[PDB]
Write an enzyme that holds these catalytic residues in place. Structure first.
Site, PDB file in Angstrom:
ATOM      1  N   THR A 236       6.964   6.739  14.080  1.00  0.00           N
ATOM      2  CA  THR A 236       5.922   7.851  14.086  1.00  0.00           C
ATOM      3  C   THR A 236       6.251   8.825  13.339  1.00  0.00           C
ATOM      4  O   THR A 236       5.470   9.392  12.292  1.00  0.00           O
ATOM      5  CB  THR A 236       5.693   8.593  15.504  1.00  0.00           C
ATOM      6  OG1 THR A 236       6.945   8.457  16.123  1.00  0.00           O
ATOM      7  CG2 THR A 236       4.774   7.712  16.509  1.00  0.00           C
ATOM      8  N   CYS A 341       3.654  12.151  25.030  1.00  0.00           N
ATOM      9  CA  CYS A 341       4.947  12.087  24.159  1.00  0.00           C
ATOM     10  C   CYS A 341       5.893  13.082  24.678  1.00  0.00           C
ATOM     11  O   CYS A 341       5.799  14.340  24.791  1.00  0.00           O
ATOM     12  CB  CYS A 341       4.599  12.425  22.686  1.00  0.00           C
ATOM     13  SG  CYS A 341       6.362  12.093  21.746  1.00  0.00           S
ATOM     14  N   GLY A 343       9.108  13.183  23.219  1.00  0.00           N
ATOM     15  CA  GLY A 343       9.435  13.695  22.154  1.00  0.00           C
ATOM     16  C   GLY A 343       8.725  14.895  21.185  1.00  0.00           C
ATOM     17  O   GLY A 343       9.272  15.180  19.963  1.00  0.00           O
TER      18      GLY A 343
HETATM   19  C1  HEM Z   1       5.062  12.622  14.948  1.00  0.00           C
HETATM   20  C2  HEM Z   1       6.105  12.210  15.750  1.00  0.00           C
HETATM   21  C3  HEM Z   1       5.392  11.462  17.081  1.00  0.00           C
HETATM   22  C4  HEM Z   1       4.093  11.051  17.602  1.00  0.00           C
HETATM   23  C5  HEM Z   1       2.712  11.186  16.592  1.00  0.00           C
HETATM   24  C6  HEM Z   1       4.080  10.628  18.867  1.00  0.00           C
HETATM   25  C7  HEM Z   1       3.049  10.091  19.536  1.00  0.00           C
HETATM   26  C8  HEM Z   1       3.388   9.610  20.820  1.00  0.00           C
HETATM   27  C9  HEM Z   1       2.220   9.101  21.785  1.00  0.00           C
HETATM   28  C10 HEM Z   1       0.597   8.999  21.167  1.00  0.00           C
HETATM   29  C11 HEM Z   1       2.632   8.729  23.018  1.00  0.00           C
HETATM   30  C12 HEM Z   1       1.887   8.083  24.198  1.00  0.00           C
HETATM   31  C13 HEM Z   1       1.626   6.955  23.916  1.00  0.00           C
HETATM   32  C14 HEM Z   1       0.619   6.023  24.976  1.00  0.00           C
HETATM   33  O1  HEM Z   1       0.168   6.832  25.595  1.00  0.00           O
HETATM   34  O2  HEM Z   1       0.534   4.765  25.057  1.00  0.00           O
HETATM   35  C15 HEM Z   1       4.184   8.864  22.755  1.00  0.00           C
HETATM   36  C16 HEM Z   1       5.121   8.683  23.740  1.00  0.00           C
HETATM   37  C17 HEM Z   1       6.276   8.704  23.827  1.00  0.00           C
HETATM   38  N1  HEM Z   1       7.206   9.342  22.802  1.00  0.00           N
HETATM   39 FE1  HEM Z   1       6.525  10.158  21.137  1.00  0.00          FE
HETATM   40  N2  HEM Z   1       5.518  10.643  19.284  1.00  0.00           N
HETATM   41  C18 HEM Z   1       6.466  11.291  18.406  1.00  0.00           C
HETATM   42  C19 HEM Z   1       7.650  11.638  18.064  1.00  0.00           C
HETATM   43  C20 HEM Z   1       8.435  11.443  19.285  1.00  0.00           C
HETATM   44  C21 HEM Z   1       9.958  11.473  19.185  1.00  0.00           C
HETATM   45  C22 HEM Z   1      10.705  12.294  17.932  1.00  0.00           C
HETATM   46  C23 HEM Z   1      10.699  10.918  20.331  1.00  0.00           C
HETATM   47  C24 HEM Z   1      12.206  11.016  20.672  1.00  0.00           C
HETATM   48  C25 HEM Z   1      12.661   9.889  20.811  1.00  0.00           C
HETATM   49  C26 HEM Z   1       9.371  10.293  21.216  1.00  0.00           C
HETATM   50  C27 HEM Z   1       9.587   9.696  22.314  1.00  0.00           C
HETATM   51  C28 HEM Z   1       8.560   9.396  23.154  1.00  0.00           C
HETATM   52  C29 HEM Z   1       9.021   8.637  24.280  1.00  0.00           C
HETATM   53  C30 HEM Z   1      10.010   8.335  25.144  1.00  0.00           C
HETATM   54  C31 HEM Z   1       7.297   8.328  24.980  1.00  0.00           C
HETATM   55  C32 HEM Z   1       6.945   7.488  26.137  1.00  0.00           C
HETATM   56  C33 HEM Z   1       6.452   8.682  27.358  1.00  0.00           C
HETATM   57  C34 HEM Z   1       6.187   7.733  28.410  1.00  0.00           C
HETATM   58  O3  HEM Z   1       5.745   6.663  28.356  1.00  0.00           O
HETATM   59  O4  HEM Z   1       6.280   8.515  29.545  1.00  0.00           O
HETATM   60  N3  HEM Z   1       8.326  10.389  20.245  1.00  0.00           N
HETATM   61  N4  HEM Z   1       4.575   9.534  21.527  1.00  0.00           N
END
Ligand code: HEM
Ligand code: CL
Length: 398
Positions: A236, A341, A343
Protein backbone atom coordinates in the site's frame (compact mmCIF):
# COMPACT_ATOMS: atom_id res chain seq x y z
CA UNK A 1 -11.66 -17.09 -19.92
CA UNK A 2 -15.09 -16.42 -18.40
CA UNK A 3 -16.97 -18.64 -15.93
CA UNK A 4 -20.51 -19.64 -16.97
CA UNK A 5 -23.24 -17.41 -15.57
CA UNK A 6 -24.90 -18.86 -12.42
CA UNK A 7 -28.69 -19.12 -13.04
CA UNK A 8 -29.60 -16.75 -10.15
CA UNK A 9 -27.75 -13.85 -11.83
CA UNK A 10 -29.78 -11.85 -14.45
CA UNK A 11 -28.09 -11.09 -17.75
CA UNK A 12 -28.76 -7.32 -17.58
CA UNK A 13 -26.38 -7.01 -14.58
CA UNK A 14 -23.41 -8.67 -16.32
CA UNK A 15 -20.37 -6.46 -16.97
CA UNK A 16 -17.14 -8.40 -17.61
CA UNK A 17 -14.64 -6.25 -15.68
CA UNK A 18 -11.24 -7.88 -15.06
CA UNK A 19 -9.74 -6.42 -11.84
CA UNK A 20 -6.30 -7.75 -12.82
CA UNK A 21 -6.44 -6.42 -16.41
CA UNK A 22 -8.94 -3.57 -16.98
CA UNK A 23 -9.18 -2.50 -20.60
CA UNK A 24 -8.43 1.23 -20.18
CA UNK A 25 -5.33 0.67 -18.01
CA UNK A 26 -3.07 2.71 -20.32
CA UNK A 27 -5.09 5.82 -19.39
CA UNK A 28 -4.10 5.24 -15.70
CA UNK A 29 -5.44 2.89 -13.01
CA UNK A 30 -8.12 5.03 -11.31
CA UNK A 31 -9.48 6.17 -14.72
CA UNK A 32 -9.67 2.50 -15.77
CA UNK A 33 -11.69 1.53 -12.68
CA UNK A 34 -14.00 4.55 -13.01
CA UNK A 35 -15.55 2.96 -16.18
CA UNK A 36 -17.66 1.06 -13.62
CA UNK A 37 -19.22 4.41 -12.68
CA UNK A 38 -20.48 5.42 -16.16
CA UNK A 39 -24.21 6.20 -16.13
CA UNK A 40 -25.19 3.02 -18.08
CA UNK A 41 -23.56 0.83 -15.39
CA UNK A 42 -25.84 -0.28 -12.44
CA UNK A 43 -24.80 0.18 -8.75
CA UNK A 44 -24.17 -3.57 -8.48
CA UNK A 45 -22.92 -5.74 -11.33
CA UNK A 46 -21.67 -9.31 -11.92
CA UNK A 47 -18.44 -10.03 -13.80
CA UNK A 48 -17.75 -13.48 -15.24
CA UNK A 49 -13.97 -12.84 -14.99
CA UNK A 50 -11.76 -14.34 -12.27
CA UNK A 51 -14.24 -17.13 -11.41
CA UNK A 52 -17.32 -14.89 -11.27
CA UNK A 53 -18.19 -12.34 -8.56
CA UNK A 54 -20.26 -9.23 -7.75
CA UNK A 55 -18.88 -5.67 -7.86
CA UNK A 56 -20.44 -2.75 -5.91
CA UNK A 57 -19.65 0.38 -8.00
CA UNK A 58 -20.88 3.30 -5.80
CA UNK A 59 -19.73 4.62 -2.43
CA UNK A 60 -23.12 4.08 -0.73
CA UNK A 61 -23.18 0.30 -1.35
CA UNK A 62 -19.44 -0.18 -0.62
CA UNK A 63 -19.87 1.50 2.80
CA UNK A 64 -23.07 -0.46 3.58
CA UNK A 65 -21.58 -3.85 2.81
CA UNK A 66 -18.43 -3.12 4.80
CA UNK A 67 -20.67 -2.14 7.72
CA UNK A 68 -22.79 -5.34 7.46
CA UNK A 69 -20.26 -8.08 8.43
CA UNK A 70 -23.13 -10.43 9.37
CA UNK A 71 -24.12 -10.76 5.69
CA UNK A 72 -20.72 -9.83 4.14
CA UNK A 73 -17.97 -12.00 5.77
CA UNK A 74 -14.17 -11.58 5.73
CA UNK A 75 -13.61 -15.36 5.87
CA UNK A 76 -12.82 -15.09 2.12
CA UNK A 77 -11.69 -11.54 1.39
CA UNK A 78 -9.81 -12.04 -1.91
CA UNK A 79 -10.99 -12.57 -5.50
CA UNK A 80 -10.47 -15.21 -6.78
CA UNK A 81 -3.74 -16.68 6.63
CA UNK A 82 -2.78 -13.31 8.25
CA UNK A 83 -4.55 -12.08 11.40
CA UNK A 84 -6.92 -10.31 11.79
CA UNK A 85 -7.71 -9.90 8.06
CA UNK A 86 -9.77 -13.12 7.76
CA UNK A 87 -11.82 -12.75 10.97
CA UNK A 88 -15.24 -11.28 11.77
CA UNK A 89 -16.35 -9.86 15.12
CA UNK A 90 -16.43 -11.16 17.88
CA UNK A 91 -13.04 -12.95 17.57
CA UNK A 92 -11.49 -10.15 15.44
CA UNK A 93 -11.84 -7.52 18.20
CA UNK A 94 -9.21 -9.08 20.50
CA UNK A 95 -6.52 -9.42 17.83
CA UNK A 96 -7.26 -5.90 16.52
CA UNK A 97 -6.90 -4.35 20.01
CA UNK A 98 -3.42 -5.89 20.39
CA UNK A 99 -2.15 -4.78 16.94
CA UNK A 100 -3.37 -1.27 17.79
CA UNK A 101 -0.88 -1.22 20.70
CA UNK A 102 1.98 -1.42 18.16
CA UNK A 103 0.80 1.09 15.45
CA UNK A 104 -1.70 3.30 17.29
CA UNK A 105 -1.63 7.10 17.42
CA UNK A 106 0.54 7.29 20.59
CA UNK A 107 3.21 5.12 18.93
CA UNK A 108 3.13 7.27 15.76
CA UNK A 109 3.49 10.46 17.84
CA UNK A 110 6.63 9.20 19.58
CA UNK A 111 8.29 7.90 16.36
CA UNK A 112 7.43 11.09 14.46
CA UNK A 113 10.97 12.52 14.32
CA UNK A 114 12.64 9.13 13.76
CA UNK A 115 10.37 9.00 10.72
CA UNK A 116 11.54 12.45 9.51
CA UNK A 117 15.25 11.53 10.03
CA UNK A 118 14.88 8.43 7.86
CA UNK A 119 13.21 10.49 5.10
CA UNK A 120 15.88 13.23 5.23
CA UNK A 121 18.78 10.81 4.97
CA UNK A 122 17.23 8.82 2.08
CA UNK A 123 16.44 12.05 0.16
CA UNK A 124 19.86 13.62 0.92
CA UNK A 125 21.75 10.67 -0.57
CA UNK A 126 19.68 10.93 -3.80
CA UNK A 127 19.66 14.74 -4.08
CA UNK A 128 23.17 15.20 -5.65
CA UNK A 129 22.54 12.52 -8.28
CA UNK A 130 19.96 14.48 -10.28
CA UNK A 131 17.95 11.27 -10.88
CA UNK A 132 16.45 8.20 -9.22
CA UNK A 133 14.20 5.16 -9.60
CA UNK A 134 11.70 6.54 -7.05
CA UNK A 135 9.81 3.28 -6.36
CA UNK A 136 13.10 1.40 -6.00
CA UNK A 137 15.14 4.15 -4.28
CA UNK A 138 12.68 5.72 -1.83
CA UNK A 139 9.13 4.29 -1.78
CA UNK A 140 10.38 0.78 -0.79
CA UNK A 141 13.36 1.58 1.51
CA UNK A 142 11.34 4.16 3.59
CA UNK A 143 8.49 1.92 4.98
CA UNK A 144 10.69 -1.20 5.34
CA UNK A 145 13.16 0.85 7.44
CA UNK A 146 10.26 2.15 9.53
CA UNK A 147 9.19 -1.48 10.13
CA UNK A 148 12.75 -2.39 11.27
CA UNK A 149 12.56 0.58 13.69
CA UNK A 150 9.10 -0.49 14.94
CA UNK A 151 9.99 -4.22 15.28
CA UNK A 152 13.53 -3.70 16.77
CA UNK A 153 15.22 -5.58 13.93
CA UNK A 154 18.81 -5.21 12.67
CA UNK A 155 19.63 -3.27 9.49
CA UNK A 156 21.54 -6.19 7.83
CA UNK A 157 18.24 -8.08 7.57
CA UNK A 158 16.70 -5.56 5.14
CA UNK A 159 17.77 -7.14 1.79
CA UNK A 160 16.53 -10.61 2.82
CA UNK A 161 13.25 -9.22 4.24
CA UNK A 162 12.68 -7.02 1.14
CA UNK A 163 13.22 -10.15 -0.96
CA UNK A 164 10.66 -12.34 0.89
CA UNK A 165 7.95 -9.65 0.78
CA UNK A 166 8.61 -8.99 -2.91
CA UNK A 167 7.82 -12.67 -3.49
CA UNK A 168 4.30 -12.41 -2.04
CA UNK A 169 3.50 -9.58 -4.48
CA UNK A 170 5.95 -10.15 -7.41
CA UNK A 171 7.25 -13.78 -7.55
CA UNK A 172 10.33 -14.68 -9.62
CA UNK A 173 9.77 -18.45 -9.37
CA UNK A 174 12.33 -19.26 -6.64
CA UNK A 175 9.64 -20.33 -4.17
CA UNK A 176 5.83 -20.69 -4.04
CA UNK A 177 3.47 -18.32 -2.19
CA UNK A 178 3.34 -20.59 0.88
CA UNK A 179 7.13 -20.97 0.67
CA UNK A 180 7.68 -17.20 0.86
CA UNK A 181 5.12 -17.26 3.71
CA UNK A 182 6.98 -20.02 5.60
CA UNK A 183 10.38 -18.42 4.98
CA UNK A 184 8.85 -15.27 6.47
CA UNK A 185 7.54 -17.29 9.44
CA UNK A 186 10.82 -19.18 9.90
CA UNK A 187 12.50 -15.77 10.10
CA UNK A 188 9.94 -14.60 12.69
CA UNK A 189 9.56 -17.55 15.16
CA UNK A 190 12.95 -17.39 17.05
CA UNK A 191 12.61 -13.61 17.55
CA UNK A 192 9.05 -14.16 18.93
CA UNK A 193 10.20 -17.02 21.23
CA UNK A 194 13.11 -15.00 22.67
CA UNK A 195 11.24 -11.73 23.28
CA UNK A 196 8.84 -13.75 25.43
CA UNK A 197 11.91 -14.25 27.69
CA UNK A 198 13.47 -10.77 27.60
CA UNK A 199 11.09 -8.30 25.92
CA UNK A 200 12.00 -4.84 24.65
CA UNK A 201 9.45 -2.09 24.06
CA UNK A 202 9.29 -3.21 20.37
CA UNK A 203 6.29 -4.44 18.33
CA UNK A 204 7.36 -8.11 18.23
CA UNK A 205 7.74 -8.16 22.04
CA UNK A 206 4.28 -6.61 22.56
CA UNK A 207 2.55 -9.02 20.19
CA UNK A 208 4.51 -11.99 21.60
CA UNK A 209 3.47 -11.22 25.18
CA UNK A 210 -0.20 -10.50 24.35
CA UNK A 211 -3.37 -11.91 25.94
CA UNK A 212 -6.35 -12.97 23.84
CA UNK A 213 -9.83 -13.95 25.09
CA UNK A 214 -8.40 -14.54 28.58
CA UNK A 215 -5.29 -16.57 27.66
CA UNK A 216 -1.74 -15.91 26.27
CA UNK A 217 -1.27 -15.64 22.49
CA UNK A 218 0.06 -18.74 20.70
CA UNK A 219 3.25 -18.75 18.61
CA UNK A 220 1.04 -19.50 15.60
CA UNK A 221 -1.23 -16.46 16.21
CA UNK A 222 1.70 -14.11 16.99
CA UNK A 223 3.60 -15.09 13.82
CA UNK A 224 0.52 -14.56 11.62
CA UNK A 225 -0.02 -11.09 13.17
CA UNK A 226 3.58 -9.83 12.82
CA UNK A 227 3.46 -11.02 9.20
CA UNK A 228 0.48 -8.72 8.47
CA UNK A 229 2.20 -5.82 10.27
CA UNK A 230 5.10 -6.30 7.86
CA UNK A 231 3.24 -6.86 4.58
CA UNK A 232 0.32 -4.52 5.56
CA UNK A 233 2.52 -1.44 5.63
CA UNK A 234 4.56 -2.15 2.50
CA UNK A 235 2.59 -2.72 -0.71
CA UNK A 236 0.00 0.00 0.00
CA UNK A 237 2.55 2.62 1.11
CA UNK A 238 5.10 1.83 -1.65
CA UNK A 239 2.46 2.15 -4.39
CA UNK A 240 0.60 5.11 -2.89
CA UNK A 241 3.77 7.20 -2.58
CA UNK A 242 4.54 6.33 -6.22
CA UNK A 243 1.08 7.54 -7.42
CA UNK A 244 1.47 10.76 -5.42
CA UNK A 245 4.99 11.50 -6.73
CA UNK A 246 3.99 10.62 -10.31
CA UNK A 247 1.19 13.24 -10.15
CA UNK A 248 3.39 15.97 -8.56
CA UNK A 249 6.14 15.39 -11.16
CA UNK A 250 3.56 15.97 -13.90
CA UNK A 251 2.01 19.05 -12.23
CA UNK A 252 4.31 22.01 -11.49
CA UNK A 253 1.33 24.15 -10.36
CA UNK A 254 0.45 21.73 -7.55
CA UNK A 255 4.12 21.53 -6.45
CA UNK A 256 4.31 25.35 -6.28
CA UNK A 257 1.12 25.56 -4.20
CA UNK A 258 2.64 23.25 -1.53
CA UNK A 259 6.04 24.95 -1.71
CA UNK A 260 4.42 28.39 -1.11
CA UNK A 261 1.81 27.08 1.35
CA UNK A 262 3.42 24.25 3.40
CA UNK A 263 0.50 24.44 5.87
CA UNK A 264 -1.79 22.97 3.14
CA UNK A 265 0.32 19.76 3.13
CA UNK A 266 -1.91 17.73 5.56
CA UNK A 267 -5.01 18.67 3.47
CA UNK A 268 -3.06 17.81 0.30
CA UNK A 269 -2.31 14.36 1.79
CA UNK A 270 -6.06 13.68 2.33
CA UNK A 271 -6.88 14.80 -1.25
CA UNK A 272 -4.14 12.56 -2.74
CA UNK A 273 -5.50 9.65 -0.65
CA UNK A 274 -8.93 10.22 -2.28
CA UNK A 275 -7.68 10.72 -5.84
CA UNK A 276 -5.08 7.91 -5.88
CA UNK A 277 -6.94 5.35 -3.74
CA UNK A 278 -5.63 1.86 -4.57
CA UNK A 279 -7.21 -1.05 -2.61
CA UNK A 280 -10.00 -3.37 -3.76
CA UNK A 281 -10.90 -6.09 -1.23
CA UNK A 282 -13.99 -8.23 -1.03
CA UNK A 283 -16.32 -10.27 1.14
CA UNK A 284 -18.31 -13.50 0.93
CA UNK A 285 -22.05 -13.88 1.51
CA UNK A 286 -23.00 -15.79 4.68
CA UNK A 287 -26.57 -16.45 3.45
CA UNK A 288 -29.11 -15.63 0.74
CA UNK A 289 -29.71 -11.87 0.85
CA UNK A 290 -31.64 -9.29 -1.16
CA UNK A 291 -29.42 -6.20 -1.45
CA UNK A 292 -30.75 -3.07 -3.16
CA UNK A 293 -33.15 -5.18 -5.26
CA UNK A 294 -30.56 -7.83 -6.20
CA UNK A 295 -30.66 -11.46 -5.08
CA UNK A 296 -27.28 -12.42 -3.61
CA UNK A 297 -26.68 -16.10 -2.87
CA UNK A 298 -24.89 -17.79 0.08
CA UNK A 299 -21.20 -18.25 -0.86
CA UNK A 300 -21.21 -15.56 -3.63
CA UNK A 301 -18.05 -13.40 -3.57
CA UNK A 302 -18.39 -9.60 -3.80
CA UNK A 303 -15.69 -7.11 -4.71
CA UNK A 304 -16.05 -3.88 -2.67
CA UNK A 305 -13.39 -1.52 -4.06
CA UNK A 306 -12.20 0.94 -1.39
CA UNK A 307 -10.80 2.84 -4.43
CA UNK A 308 -14.21 3.69 -5.95
CA UNK A 309 -15.99 5.47 -3.07
CA UNK A 310 -13.92 8.68 -3.34
CA UNK A 311 -13.99 8.67 -7.16
CA UNK A 312 -17.82 8.47 -7.12
CA UNK A 313 -19.29 11.76 -8.43
CA UNK A 314 -22.06 11.31 -5.86
CA UNK A 315 -19.41 11.73 -3.07
CA UNK A 316 -17.04 14.37 -4.54
CA UNK A 317 -17.78 16.80 -7.42
CA UNK A 318 -15.42 16.60 -10.46
CA UNK A 319 -13.73 13.56 -8.82
CA UNK A 320 -10.77 13.27 -11.25
CA UNK A 321 -9.75 16.88 -10.45
CA UNK A 322 -7.08 17.29 -7.72
CA UNK A 323 -8.01 20.31 -5.59
CA UNK A 324 -6.11 20.70 -2.31
CA UNK A 325 -8.81 23.09 -1.04
CA UNK A 326 -11.93 20.84 -1.15
CA UNK A 327 -13.97 21.67 1.95
CA UNK A 328 -15.19 18.05 2.22
CA UNK A 329 -12.88 15.24 1.10
CA UNK A 330 -14.95 12.03 1.15
CA UNK A 331 -13.23 8.58 0.69
CA UNK A 332 -12.84 5.01 2.02
CA UNK A 333 -9.15 4.75 1.12
CA UNK A 334 -8.24 3.05 4.43
CA UNK A 335 -11.46 1.01 4.35
CA UNK A 336 -14.72 1.15 6.33
CA UNK A 337 -16.27 -0.87 9.17
CA UNK A 338 -14.46 -3.10 11.66
CA UNK A 339 -11.34 -3.74 9.51
CA UNK A 340 -10.59 -0.07 8.95
CA UNK A 341 -6.81 0.26 8.57
CA UNK A 342 -4.92 0.13 11.87
CA UNK A 343 -1.90 1.75 10.15
CA UNK A 344 -3.87 4.80 8.90
CA UNK A 345 -2.20 7.21 11.34
CA UNK A 346 1.30 5.88 10.49
CA UNK A 347 0.54 6.06 6.73
CA UNK A 348 -0.62 9.74 6.91
CA UNK A 349 2.53 10.71 8.82
CA UNK A 350 4.70 8.83 6.28
CA UNK A 351 2.97 10.67 3.39
CA UNK A 352 3.13 14.10 5.08
CA UNK A 353 6.83 13.82 6.07
CA UNK A 354 7.63 12.64 2.50
CA UNK A 355 5.86 15.62 0.92
CA UNK A 356 7.55 18.13 3.25
CA UNK A 357 11.13 16.76 3.11
CA UNK A 358 11.08 16.16 -0.67
CA UNK A 359 9.58 19.54 -1.61
CA UNK A 360 12.03 21.32 0.74
CA UNK A 361 15.12 19.62 -0.71
CA UNK A 362 14.05 18.86 -4.33
CA UNK A 363 11.30 21.38 -5.19
CA UNK A 364 11.59 21.03 -8.98
CA UNK A 365 11.50 17.57 -10.61
CA UNK A 366 10.06 15.80 -13.66
CA UNK A 367 9.38 12.40 -15.19
CA UNK A 368 12.58 11.27 -16.98
CA UNK A 369 12.32 12.56 -20.59
CA UNK A 370 11.01 9.84 -22.93
CA UNK A 371 9.58 7.63 -20.15
CA UNK A 372 5.99 6.34 -20.18
CA UNK A 373 4.85 5.35 -16.71
CA UNK A 374 3.30 1.87 -16.49
CA UNK A 375 0.62 0.90 -13.98
CA UNK A 376 -0.62 -2.45 -12.62
CA UNK A 377 -4.10 -3.36 -11.36
CA UNK A 378 -4.99 -5.78 -8.53
CA UNK A 379 -6.06 -6.13 -4.91
CA UNK A 380 -3.48 -3.36 -4.47
CA UNK A 381 -3.06 -1.34 -7.70
CA UNK A 382 0.30 0.30 -8.38
CA UNK A 383 3.21 1.78 -10.29
CA UNK A 384 5.78 -0.50 -11.90
CA UNK A 385 8.61 2.07 -12.02
CA UNK A 386 9.01 5.83 -11.62
CA UNK A 387 12.16 7.33 -13.16
CA UNK A 388 12.57 10.96 -11.95
CA UNK A 389 15.10 13.67 -12.88
CA UNK A 390 16.09 17.09 -11.51
CA UNK A 391 18.90 19.68 -11.60
CA UNK A 392 21.13 19.44 -8.48
CA UNK A 393 21.88 23.22 -8.74
CA UNK A 394 18.20 23.93 -7.88
CA UNK A 395 18.11 21.77 -4.77
CA UNK A 396 18.91 22.58 -1.10
CA UNK A 397 20.84 20.51 1.45
CA UNK A 398 19.07 20.98 4.82
C1 HEM B 1 -1.49 4.28 2.06
C2 HEM B 1 -1.28 3.35 3.00
C3 HEM B 1 -2.37 2.33 3.42
C4 HEM B 1 -3.55 2.04 2.84
C5 HEM B 1 -4.16 2.70 1.59
C6 HEM B 1 -4.20 1.00 3.62
C7 HEM B 1 -5.44 0.42 3.36
C8 HEM B 1 -6.04 -0.53 4.15
C9 HEM B 1 -7.39 -1.09 3.99
C10 HEM B 1 -8.40 -0.72 2.87
C11 HEM B 1 -7.58 -1.99 4.98
C12 HEM B 1 -8.86 -2.84 5.24
C13 HEM B 1 -8.96 -3.99 4.25
C14 HEM B 1 -10.26 -4.79 4.37
O1 HEM B 1 -11.26 -4.33 4.96
O2 HEM B 1 -10.29 -5.92 3.83
C15 HEM B 1 -6.37 -2.03 5.78
C16 HEM B 1 -6.16 -2.81 6.90
C17 HEM B 1 -5.03 -2.95 7.68
N1 HEM B 1 -3.87 -2.20 7.60
FE1 HEM B 1 -3.62 -0.69 6.12
N2 HEM B 1 -3.36 0.69 4.67
C18 HEM B 1 -2.24 1.48 4.58
C19 HEM B 1 -1.15 1.49 5.42
C20 HEM B 1 -0.89 0.66 6.48
C21 HEM B 1 0.28 0.68 7.32
C22 HEM B 1 1.47 1.68 7.20
C23 HEM B 1 0.16 -0.31 8.21
C24 HEM B 1 1.20 -0.63 9.32
C25 HEM B 1 1.81 -1.82 9.37
C26 HEM B 1 -1.11 -0.98 7.96
C27 HEM B 1 -1.65 -2.04 8.67
C28 HEM B 1 -2.91 -2.58 8.52
C29 HEM B 1 -3.44 -3.68 9.31
C30 HEM B 1 -2.73 -4.44 10.46
C31 HEM B 1 -4.85 -3.91 8.75
C32 HEM B 1 -5.88 -4.97 9.21
C33 HEM B 1 -6.98 -4.37 10.10
C34 HEM B 1 -7.92 -5.47 10.56
O3 HEM B 1 -8.04 -6.52 9.87
O4 HEM B 1 -8.59 -5.33 11.60
N3 HEM B 1 -1.73 -0.34 6.91
N4 HEM B 1 -5.47 -1.12 5.25
CL1 CL C 1 11.54 2.94 -9.94
Amino acid sequence: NLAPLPPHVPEHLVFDFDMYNPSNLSAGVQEAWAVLQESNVPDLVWTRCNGGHWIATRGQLIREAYEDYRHFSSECPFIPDFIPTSMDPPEQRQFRALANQVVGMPVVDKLENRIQELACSLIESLRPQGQCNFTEDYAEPFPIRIFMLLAGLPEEDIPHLKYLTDQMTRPDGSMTFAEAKEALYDYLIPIIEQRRQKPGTDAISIVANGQVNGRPITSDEAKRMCGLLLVGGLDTVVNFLSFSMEFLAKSPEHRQELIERPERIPAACEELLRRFSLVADGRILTSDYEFHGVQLKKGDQILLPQMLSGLDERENAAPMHVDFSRQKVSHTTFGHGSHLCLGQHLARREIIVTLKEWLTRIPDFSIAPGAQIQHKSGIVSGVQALPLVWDPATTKAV
